[PDB]
Amino acid sequence: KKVVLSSFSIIGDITQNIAKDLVTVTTLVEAGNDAHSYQVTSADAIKIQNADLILCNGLHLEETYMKYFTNLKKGTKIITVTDGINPIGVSEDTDSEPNPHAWMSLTNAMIYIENIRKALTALDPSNAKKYELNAREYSEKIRNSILPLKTRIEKVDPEKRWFVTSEGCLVYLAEDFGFKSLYLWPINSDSERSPSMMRHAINQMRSHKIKFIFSESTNSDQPAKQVAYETNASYGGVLYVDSLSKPDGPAPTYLDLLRFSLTKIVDTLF
Template structure:
């Protein structure tokens, strides 16, 4: 039975309803997916706020209070949001669903010698939502979890999920076509974090990066030197940074190699409602267009 929605200071005002499925998610991307699947039948809250660095997030007491009345908790898994376990384990009789279940995870690698970029070979890359096929698996898992938690509305969740998957495909399909038309000598995606393996695979790009996962010690001298050497060897023309990290290392490498600094990419977190990527579809579009606009620029 669905718990009555408890209005908390940490939640934005919701449309009044007699009863909704109260869903908590580990971060904002999953929250937006869940809102599209749940529609008016679900109230969704992200534990991490917009713009937050998801890796190694430190939940506050308010975060814990904010999910106390959850009927369902959605997490990414693949070592991205393990920090949530410290308090999710305290929730009694609340389903905790890993939405990445069923995807074929890519390992964290940067080249044949993954240590060249500081990569931790063998660990799964957790950013599965950046690929069309994986994102659709996420949506299916969310719909299935909501249907199990609220079986009376299972058909509505399934219909919402199918429509949402069509919208995701409509955004990413034309962008993928643009990427596949790039000249061979510009098919490089160089970033600060190795968060774009799934997107790079789908777009036919060779991925290079400074560090594998956002953590302490980003942009060490060894990481910087390794990436400078790799960019000079391959002629990679552009380097980007992500919204949740400093752009200084990427800009420094651009200056050192003569490459362009292509700007900010969004991957781990959505923005506030009035920001550049308030939804997951915006994140896919803005990030992909930023990459392609730079790589197409002769």
């Protein structure tokens, strides 16, 4: 039985839905661990050795631990599951390093799925028909759950078309649905979170009468709450974007993560 190692929980879950136990699906950065800054352990290095295929996000998500994907099993490829996604830069001024959060998007969910289907099929061609069926079923499950939320979201008055968060985690969602983005820092890892970016967000929220700003499940709510105060806006609560929740939490699968976060967003806009 083949072993397919996913870099983090969101990719591992997508992969499990496509492979359904035809391969063993492992995960490097388990849920609750940070995919932006991770220390590969000795046990993790076993997972890396056992991998017949390695599935990474790319868009520099894994940049600080790519060095551990070395001394690999002969024939083991590293696949970038965001291939075909046009990158969005980390500069709020449009060039720069890529924003990695491409999975927060309905269109892109379909691309992650297709890339993973394609890679599994190249790895394990005797099961091509099963990966084919499974990928389509899962794509449809995603669409069936998430499309109605998009449909709701698209009714928003153009003046209110803003997703404002702490980390720049919704830039791909904004692009997918036709909203503008505002945030406090591009990526949670960066230890430099800047006064200028906070000042800018505050000024922009005032300018555009933006009513809500969120924080996320792996960062502090304190900046968002402060910005809310300074802008006469409201704190919108906690989104799930960077990791699956614990099994008994609200976002234990990728579909549940998208569904939770987009539900919470649309419940703010109306």
